[PDB]
Design a protein around this ligand. Structure first.
Ligand SMILES: [Mg+2]
Ligand SMILES: [Mg+2]
Ligand SMILES: [Mg+2]
Ligand SMILES: [Mg+2]
Ligand SMILES: [Mg+2]
Ligand SMILES: [Mg+2]
Ligand SMILES: [Mg+2]
Ligand SMILES: [Mg+2]
Ligand SMILES: [Mg+2]
Ligand SMILES: [Mg+2]
Ligand SMILES: [Mg+2]
Ligand SMILES: [Mg+2]
Ligand SMILES: [Mg+2]
Ligand SMILES: [Mg+2]
Ligand SMILES: [Mg+2]
Ligand SMILES: [Mg+2]
Ligand SMILES: [Mg+2]
Ligand SMILES: [Mg+2]
Ligand SMILES: [Mg+2]
Ligand SMILES: [Mg+2]
Ligand SMILES: [Mg+2]
Ligand SMILES: [Mg+2]
Ligand SMILES: [Mg+2]
Ligand SMILES: [Mg+2]
Ligand SMILES: [Mg+2]
Ligand SMILES: [Mg+2]
Ligand SMILES: [Mg+2]
Ligand SMILES: [Mg+2]
Ligand SMILES: [Mg+2]
Ligand SMILES: [Mg+2]
Lengths: 122, 127, 211, 88, 176, 201, 41, 97
RNA sequence: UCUCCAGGCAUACGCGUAUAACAACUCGGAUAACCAUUGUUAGUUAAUCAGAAUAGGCAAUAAUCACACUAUAAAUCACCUAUAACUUCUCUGUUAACCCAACACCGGAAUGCCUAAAGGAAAGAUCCAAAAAGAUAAAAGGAACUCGGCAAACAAGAACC
RNA sequence: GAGCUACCUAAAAACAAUUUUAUGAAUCAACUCGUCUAUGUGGCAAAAUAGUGAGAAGAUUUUUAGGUAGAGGUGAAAAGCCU
RNA sequence: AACUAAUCCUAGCCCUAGCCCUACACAAAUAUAAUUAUACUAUUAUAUAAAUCAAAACAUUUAUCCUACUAAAAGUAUUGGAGAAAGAAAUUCGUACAUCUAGGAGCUAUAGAACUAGUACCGCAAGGGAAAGAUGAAAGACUAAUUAAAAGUAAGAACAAGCAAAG
C-alpha cells in the first residue's frame, strides 16, 4: 500500500528519519550535542561596487553582434605567451627551464585557486 | 551557489568566497497577515537562512534582524491525460524580519486606472 | 499577431454625405454641387485619377448602376461566390446575414432618372464614391416554408437610395465594389412586415412593482 | 511562538501547603545566546533592552499571578489586593 | 533596498515595458573579467525583479507585462556563464592539460555497465575509508547473461528503427 | 512530439494549444523533404500562383511554415470569415488567406515580372545568392520587418538598455588568470591561508 | 488476420429476409432467426 | 456485420516495371550456360533455405544448424521449444500410425 | 434559538495536500443543499517541542512513597588518571475531517490527559396494510411448550451423577 | 515472503474500585477473549452486529525493532499457523 | 423524418538480407532507510541442472533442451529394460551476390510487439500487467461528413387459442 514512485524525503517516515534538502553544511556537530558553525565554511558573497558602471541588463537592438569565435587554448596562448617568447627568441634569452617566467605554473599545489582539481565554486 | 562543489574545509582553511551568485529569489506577497517588519521570500531549496542574510545585506544593502525558513510540500495529486501524477515543485519560504525599526508593505502592482418593428428582414433593402 | 490581419475594405464611410432635403423630386443642381465641393471632392478625384487614370465621373454611373443590378440578382440565385466580388466585406453581411433560410425574389424595373455621382472621398488608401439611384424595384421574401413575409409578389415601387462604392486603390487586384447605403432622414418609412408583432413589456420579479 | 498540550500548572516555586506563599525578589541570568555582543552582531541592537523587559514582564506576571491564585483569586473572582514582586 | 525587487513605479500597471536585446556571447567576450563580474550582479537584480513580478501576476490572475524580458535576461546570464567557463577551460588546458575540472574515472558498476564516476573530496585516503570501500566497482559472473540481453535488446530497437526509415522512404517516393 | 501537426497558428499560442492537445493522435501529414539549401522562398519575395483560384496572380510572401512546405501570400488564395464574433455581435467579415505549397508558386524576376525558376550559386565575394535559371540575374534577399515588431532604426533605448558605444567598448586584456584571481586583486581582498590536502576518490 | 471473410453481411441477410414477418427476436436475431426459418421451410 | 460506406482508393499496378518485365530471366542459366551455375544459386532468401525445402520441423532444425550460434537468447530459446513441440507432434500424435 | 445524543483533545505510527479561499457545477459523495469533486491561488516559521576527541583504571549491597519491613522469580553512563581542543545556531519535522480494511465500510488501530467547558444529530416527504425484525405491557394458568426451560422472566436460588 | 499468523530476542508500556488465609485468590470495570441466542447471509463485515457470557497482578495483555523460509520454519498437536 | 451506434488509415509491428562493436551523450546528487557534500562499519557467482514428459505403469533408459561447417556416406556401422528410442565417423562436395543498406502471393488498431506503456492499475515482495486513436488544402476556414444498415430502444402497450410458424 506504500507509494513507490514518489521521492524519499524527510517529511516522510518516522521522526528518527531525517535527511537534508541539499543545503551545504556550514558547521560541525561536536560531542555534547552542540552545533559549532565555522565562519570559513559559510559562503561569502563578493559583490563589486556598481557606481559609475555603464553596463545595463539589455543592449541596443542596433548593436551588431560579432562573429562567434569561442576561445581556445591556442587563441589564449597567442594573445598572452607568444609575444614574450618571440621577443626573447630574437634576443636569444630563452630557455626551457624558465617557462615559469612567461606565466607557466608547474603545479597547482599552493595556489588559492587551483585549476585542477578545482577548489573554488563558480 | 547551487549545483556546484564547495572546496572541503579543514582546520586553517581559507574563507569560502562565491564571486558569482547562482541563487535567485523572489519577493512574494504574504498569504497570511504578517507584522510590518516581516517580508516573505521564495528561495532555492539549497539556500540556508544564513545565506539569505548575507545575500540581502550584501547584494541589496538591506539590514536583516532575523530569518526563518520552512519547506512547503508540493501537491502530487493532479493527474494528466495518461493518469500520471503531476508533481508541483517543493519550495522553500523565508521570513525576514527587518532591522532598525524599518517597515515594508508589498506594493500594489497593477494599480489600474435590428428594429423590433420589422424583424428578420435585412435593413439594407431600400424598397 | 505575427502576420498583420489584411483588410481590403474599411467599415463605415469616410465622410457621410448629407443628402439635401427635397432631393427626391423631378423624377444640373446636384451636378453643380459636386463641382461646388470640388476642393473637397475634386482633389479626391485627382488622387483617384493618379492610381486609376481612367476614372471619369461621366461613365462611372453606368458601371456603378451595373454593379448594383447584378449584385442584388445574386440574392435570387444565392450565388455568394459572385456576390463577394460585387460587394465589399463590409456590405456583404448586411445584405445576406438575415436572408439565411429565406428565398428572395428581386427584379429591377426601368430606372426613373439617370444615375449621377454626388460625392466622393479618399482616406493604405481607399476611395469611396457615393451614387444616387432612383429606380422602380420588386421584392418578395419567403419563409423556410415558402410563405410570404415581406413585399408584394409583383408590383413595382419607386426607390430613391444613395449607394457608396469603394475601391482599394493600392492593390493591383482591387476593384469597385458596393460598400454601403446612406439613408436620408427625410426618407418615408418602408413597408411594414405583413405579420403582427407583440413587444413584451417589462418583466417583474415578486419584489418589483409596475410603474 | 508554538503550541503544545501538556499539564497546566500554577506554581509559585512551592506547593500551596508552604507557609511562605508570597514573593520578595527574583534574580534572572540572561542566557549567553541573548547577551549583548551576540545581539549586536546579529544586527538586532535595539533588542538589548527588549530582552530584559520581556524576561521581567513574563517572569513577574507568572509569579504574582500564581501568588494571587494561591489566595483564591481567579478571573471570575478578581484580586482585591494588588500583588507585588520585583526582579533584578 | 527592497525597492529593487520591483520595477520603476511608473511602469507599474503598464501593459507593456520596452526592453532591448539580450547580451550575445561575442559582445561579452570583449569585456574584461572584472566587468563580467559586475555585469553578472546587474543581471541578477533584474532577474529577481522579473521573477518577483512573474509570481505577483499569478497571484493576481493577470498577464505578466512583457514576459519576454525574463527570457532575455536568462539568456544573457547563460552567455556570461559560458564566456567565463570558456576562459577558465582554456586556462586549465594550458596549465594542466586536463579536459575536465573534476577528477573522475571510467568504472564498471555491479550491474555490468560502464559509467563515468565523479570523484568526491575526502579527508582520508581511499584505503582507510570504510564507507567508500563498501562501494563495489566490479561485476560478478552472473551479470554476463544480462550484458548479452541488453545488447540483444538494443539490437532489436536499432533494427526496427532502420526498417521503419526504409518503410517511410517508400511512402515518400510513392507519394512523390 | 511525433503527433504534433504544424498549422497556420503560431506554435505555442493559445490557438495552437487548443488544436494540438497532448492526447491528439491525428494522422501524420506527408511532406516532401526539402533541404535548407534547396529552399529558395523567403518572406517578402514576390511570387506568382501557378494554379488555383488565383492562378496567375502575383503576391508577396508574409509567412513561411517550413515544416509543411507552406508559403502564405498576402491577400491571395483568400476565403472569408468573421473575426471577433461574440454572442451579442456577429463580428467583422474579413478575407483570410490559405497556405500554398512550394510547388504551387514560382519566384518572380525583378526587372521583368515573370515566374523565373532560379538556381543557387555563389558570387565573387563568396556569398550565396539565388540566380535565375534563364536570364541569369541576382534576385536579392528581400527585407522583412522583424517578427517581434522591433524596428532597429526607429528604436530609441530607455533606461536599463546599454548604449551602442558602451556595449562595443573593449576592456578585456588577455592574461593567464581566472575571474576569481582578477576580482580579488581588483577588489583588494587578501587571503594567505591555503586549503589542506584533500583526497579525491 | 491475412484472410477475413468480407461477405458475411449478405450471408446474414439470406436468413433474415425470410424472418422479417415473424414476431419477437425471431425476426431480427440471426441465431434465433435461422432456427425459425428452417422450421418454416 | 458492418461494411465500408466508401470505396477504397483504386489499386494501381504497373505491369511493365523493371521487376515484372524481366521476371524469370536467367532461370535457364545452367542449360543455356553450360551448367556453370545451377538456377537455385539465383534464389535470394534466408541462408538456411536457399535452394532447399522441408516441413516446419525440418526448417526449425535447419535454421538452428545454420545460424543457431548467432541467434539471440530469446529467439534461440523459442526456437528450441518449437523443435521439441514439433518433435512430439510428428512422432507421437496424429491419426495414422 | 430550540430539541435531543455522549469519547473528546493531544502525541506516536501511518497517510501525502484530502488543509484554506476563490471560481466552477462536466466527473466524484451511492440523493440534494453544500462540497470531501474540478480549476486557480495560497499554506506548516523553533537553540527551549521533535530528529540528526583519544587511551587507561574500576564497581558485592534491586524496585515497590524505601523507612520498618518481608520476600524471590534476584531485578539499569558515572567516577578517577593522563592526552587533545580553548567560544557555537546551521540542517530537518510541524497543514488536514487523515491510517489498515477494493468504498465517506456498524470493522481493526498504541500512549497521556480528561468525561463534557470538548464533540455531535437517530427522522428526504407522507402513510399506518400483510409478512418479517426490535422494544414494552398481560386477565386466569405457570413448562401443560420443546429434541432440550432454547429464548424470555417481578426469577438469577438449592442439590446430585 | 514472518508489516498477517506461530514461536523467540531486545527495548518499553498498562492494570481503577472493592474484599482477601496475600495470591496463576474473590467481586467487577478499562482491557483481552469469544460461551449461547437472534439478526445478517452479494451483509456495515470475503466472519460483522445486538444482547448474553469467560479471564481481568498474570503461564496476563499490549507497543516498537530484530530473528527462524517451503526437501523448510514454528506448534501448551488443532496435522494448527507461515499475507 | 432517430437515438444508442457504425464506417475510416497509419501509428507502428513481423520475418529475412546486410553489418561486429567501439554512444561511454551538461552542473549537481546516489550504494547511507540509493539518488543525503567528508572519516564511524570493510568488500567477493557456482561443486554435476532437475523434473515434467515418452516407455501407453515404472525403477536402466527418453531426440531438442545440453550448438562447433553445409550436401552425401546414412537413418548405414554401432548403442539400447537390444524395449521406447538413440545414432556416428572414415571419406567425397562446397569461391556465395561480394557492391553500394535490400526485400515481402507479411500484419493494418480484438491484427501486427504486451506497448499510446513495462505506464495506469493489482501485489508486502518476487512478480503480473491493460485499455485506446481517426475533419479539411486551410480551424489565422466556429470540428467534417458518411450509413433502410447490429443487438437495444423510440416512433407505435395489449385484445379468447397455445415451440408462435405453415397451408
Ligand atoms: Mg463556492
Ligand atoms: Mg451524484
Ligand atoms: Mg475542505
Ligand atoms: Mg479542491
Ligand atoms: Mg524549522
Ligand atoms: Mg496541527
Ligand atoms: Mg472489504
Ligand atoms: Mg458541543
Ligand atoms: Mg423515516
Ligand atoms: Mg416483559
Ligand atoms: Mg399473563
Ligand atoms: Mg413436557
Ligand atoms: Mg408436547
Ligand atoms: Mg436461557
Ligand atoms: Mg514481527
Ligand atoms: Mg488493580
Ligand atoms: Mg484470579
Ligand atoms: Mg468473572
Ligand atoms: Mg471465576
Ligand atoms: Mg501458543
Ligand atoms: Mg490429535
Ligand atoms: Mg486428526
Ligand atoms: Mg510412462
Ligand atoms: Mg499411475
Ligand atoms: Mg506417475
Ligand atoms: Mg525416473
Ligand atoms: Mg494491440
Ligand atoms: Mg494488447
Ligand atoms: Mg435496429
Ligand atoms: Mg392460433
Amino acid at each position: 500500500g506504500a507509494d513507490r514512485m514518489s521521492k524519499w524525503t524527510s517529511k516522510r517516515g518516522p521522526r528518527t528519519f531525517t535527511k537534508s534538502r541539499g543545503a551545504k553544511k556550514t558547521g560541525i556537530y561536536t560531542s555534547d550535542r552542540k552545533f559549532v558553525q565555522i565562519k570559513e565554511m559559510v559562503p561569502e558573497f563578493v559583490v563589486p561596487d556598481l557606481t559609475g558602471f555603464k553596463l545595463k541588463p539589455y543592449v541596443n537592438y542596433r548593436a551588431p553582434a560579432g562573429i562567434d569565435t569561442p576561445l581556445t587554448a591556442k587563441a589564449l596562448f597567442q594573445e598572452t605567451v607568444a609575444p614574450a617568447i618571440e621577443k626573447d627568441f630574437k634576443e636569444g634569452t630563452f630557455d626551457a627551464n624558465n617557462l615559469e617566467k612567461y606565466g607557466f605554473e608547474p603545479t597547482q599545489e599552493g595556489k588559492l585557486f587551483q585549476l585542477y582539481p578545482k577548489n573554488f565554486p563558480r | 551557489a547551487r549545483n556546484v562543489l564547495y572546496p572541503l574545509y579543514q582546520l586553517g582553511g581559507p574563507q569560502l568566497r562565491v564571486f558569482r551568485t547562482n541563487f535567485f529569489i523572489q519577493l512574494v506577497r504574504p498569504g497570511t497577515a504578517q507584522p510590518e517588519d516581516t517580508v516573505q521570500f521564495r528561495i532555492p531549496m539549497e539556500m540556508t537562512r544564513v545565506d539569505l542574510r548575507n545575500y540581502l545585506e550584501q547584494i541589496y544593502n538591506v539590514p536583516v534582524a532575523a530569518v526563518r525558513t520552512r519547506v512547503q510540500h508540493g501537491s502530487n495529486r493532479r493527474r494528466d491525460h495518461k493518469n500520471v501524477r503531476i508533481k508541483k515543485p517543493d519550495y522553500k519560504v523565508a521570513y525576514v524580519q527587518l532591522a532598525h525599526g524599518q517597515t515594508f508593505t508589498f506594493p500594489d502592482l497593477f494599480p489600474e486606472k435590428s428594429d423590433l418593428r420589422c424583424p428578420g428582414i435585412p435593413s439594407w433593402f431600400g424598397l | 499577431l505575427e502576420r498583420p490581419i489584411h483588410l481590403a475594405c474599411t467599415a463605415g464611410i469616410f465622410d457621410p454625405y448629407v443628402p439635401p432635403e427635397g432631393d427626391a423630386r423631378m423624377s444640373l443642381t446636384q451636378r453643380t454641387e459636386r463641382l461646388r465641393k470640388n476642393a473637397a471632392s475634386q482633389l479626391a478625384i485627382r488622387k483617384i485619377r493618379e492610381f486609376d487614370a481612367n476614372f471619369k465621373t461621366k461613365d462611372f454611373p453606368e458601371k456603378a448602376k451595373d454593379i448594383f443590378i447584378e449584385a442584388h440578382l445574386c440574392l435570387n440565385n444565392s450565388d455568394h461566390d459572385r456576390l463577394h466580388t460585387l460587394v465589399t466585406e463590409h456590405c456583404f453581411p448586411d445584405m445576406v446575414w438575415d436572408l439565411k433560410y429565406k428565398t428572395v425574389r428581386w427584379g429591377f424595373v426601368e430606372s426613373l432618372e439617370p444615375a449621377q455621382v454626388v460625392h466622393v472621398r479618399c482616406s493604405n488608401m481607399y476611395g469611396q464614391v457615393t451614387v444616387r439611384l432612383h429606380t422602380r424595384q420588386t421584392l418578395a421574401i419567403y419563409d423556410r416554408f415558402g410563405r410570404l413575409m415581406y413585399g408584394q409578389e409583383d408590383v413595382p415601387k419607386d426607390v430613391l437610395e444613395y449607394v457608396v462604392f469603394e475601391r482599394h486603390l493600392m492593390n493591383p487586384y482591387g476593384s469597385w465594389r458596393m460598400h454601403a447605403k446612406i439613408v436620408p432622414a427625410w426618407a418615408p418609412p418602408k413597408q411594414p412586415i405583413l405579420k403582427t408583432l407583440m413587444i413584451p413589456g417589462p418583466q417583474l420579479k415578486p419584489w418589483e412593482e409596475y410603474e | 511562538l508554538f503550541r503544545r498540550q501538556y499539564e497546566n500548572s500554577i506554581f509559585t516555586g512551592s506547593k500551596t501547603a508552604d507557609p511562605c506563599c508570597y514573593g520578595h525578589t527574583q534574580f534572572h541570568l540572561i542566557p549567553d545566546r541573548l547577551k549583548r555582543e551576540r545581539l549586536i552582531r546579529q544586527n538586532q541592537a535595539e533588542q538589548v533592552e527588549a530582552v530584559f523587559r520581556a524576561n521581567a514582564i513574563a517572569s513577574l506576571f507568572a509569579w504574582t499571578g500564581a501568588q494571587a491564585m494561591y489566595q483564591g483569586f481567579w478571573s471570575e473572582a478578581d484580586v482585591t489586593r494588588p500583588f507585588v514582586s520585583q526582579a533584578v | 533596498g527592497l525597492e529593487e525587487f520591483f520595477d520603476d513605479p511608473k511602469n507599474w500597471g503598464e501593459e507593456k515595458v520596452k526592453s532591448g536585446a539580450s547580451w550575445t556571447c561575442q559582445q561579452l567576450r570583449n569585456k574584461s573579467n572584472e566587468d563580467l563580474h559586475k555585469l553578472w550582479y546587474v543581471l541578477l537584480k533584474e532577474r529577481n525583479m522579473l521573477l518577483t513580478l512573474e509570481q505577483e501576476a499569478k497571484r493576481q490572475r493577470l498577464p505578466m507585462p512583457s514576459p519576454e524580458r525574463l527570457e532575455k535576461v536568462v539568456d544573457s546570464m547563460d552567455n556570461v556563464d559560458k564566456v567565463v567557463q570558456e576562459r577558465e577551460d582554456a586556462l586549465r588546458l594550458l596549465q594542466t592539460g586536463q579536459e575536465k575540472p573534476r577528477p573522475g574515472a571510467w568504472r564498471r558498476d555491479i550491474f555490468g555497465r560502464i559509467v563515468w564516476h565523479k570523484f568526491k573530496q575526502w579527508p582520508i585516503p581511499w584505503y582507510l575509508n570504510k564507507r567508500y570501500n563498501r562501494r563495489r566497482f566490479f561485476a560478478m559472473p552472473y551479470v554476463d547473461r544480462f550484458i548479452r540481453l541488453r545488447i540483444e535488446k538494443h539490437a532489436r530497437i536499432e533494427a526496427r528503427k532502420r526498417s521503419l526509415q526504409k518503410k517511410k522512404e517508400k511512402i515518400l517516393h510513392a507519394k512523390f | 512530439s511525433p503527433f504534433y501537426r504544424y498549422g497556420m497558428s503560431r506554435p505555442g499560442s493559445i490557438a495552437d494549444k487548443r488544436k494540438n492537445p497532448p492526447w491528439s493522435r491525428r494522422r501524420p501529414v506527408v511532406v516532401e523533404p526539402i533541404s535548407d539549401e534547396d529552399w529558395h522562398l523567403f518572406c517578402g519575395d514576390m511570387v506568382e500562383i501557378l494554379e488555383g483560384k488565383d492562378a496567375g496572380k502575383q503576391g508577396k510572401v508574409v509567412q513561411v511554415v517550413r515544416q509543411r512546405n507552406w508559403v502564405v501570400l498576402e491577400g491571395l488564395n483568400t476565403h472569408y470569415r468573421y473575426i471577433g464574433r461574440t454572442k451579442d455581435h456577429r463580428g467583422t467579415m474579413i478575407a483570410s488567406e490559405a497556405p500554398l505549397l512550394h510547388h504551387q508558386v514560382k519566384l518572380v524576376d525583378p526587372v521583368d515580372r515573370k515566374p523565373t525558376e532560379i538556381q543557387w550559386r555563389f558570387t565573387e565575394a563568396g556569398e550565396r545568392v539565388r540566380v535565375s535559371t534563364r536570364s541569369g540575374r541576382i534576385i536579392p534577399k528581400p527585407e522583412f520587418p522583424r517578427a517581434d515588431g522591433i524596428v532597429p532604426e526607429t528604436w530609441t533605448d530607455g533606461p536599463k538598455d546599454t548604449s551602442v558605444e558602451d556595449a562595443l567598448e573593449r576592456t578585456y586584456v588577455p592574461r593567464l588568470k581566472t575571474l576569481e584571481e582578477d576580482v580579488m586583486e581588483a577588489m583588494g581582498i587578501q587571503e594567505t591561508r591555503r586549503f589542506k590536502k584533500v583526497y579525491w576518490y | 488476420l491475412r484472410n477475413r471473410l468480407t461477405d458475411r453481411y449478405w450471408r446474414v441477410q439470406e436468413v433474415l429476409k425470410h424472418a422479417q414477418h415473424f414476431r419477437g427476436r425471431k425476426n431480427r436475431c440471426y441465431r434465433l432467426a435461422v432456427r425459425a426459418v428452417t422450421r418454416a421451410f | 456485420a458492418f461494411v465500408r460506406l466508401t470505396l477504397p482508393p483504386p489499386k494501381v499496378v504497373d505491369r511493365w516495371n523493371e521487376k515484372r518485365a524481366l521476371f524469370g530471366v536467367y532461370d535457364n542459366i545452367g542449360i543455356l550456360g553450360n551448367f556453370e551455375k545451377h538456377p537455385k544459386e539465383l534464389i535470394k532468401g534466408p541462408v538456411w533455405l536457399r535452394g532447399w525445402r522441408g516441413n516446419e520441423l525440418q526448417r526449425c532444425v535447419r535454421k538452428k544448424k545454420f545460424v543457431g550460434n548467432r541467434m539471440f537468447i530469446e529467439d534461440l530459446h523459442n526456437l528450441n521449444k518449437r523443435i521439441s513441440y514439433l518433435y512430439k507432434h510428428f512422432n507421437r500424435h496424429g491419426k495414422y500410425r
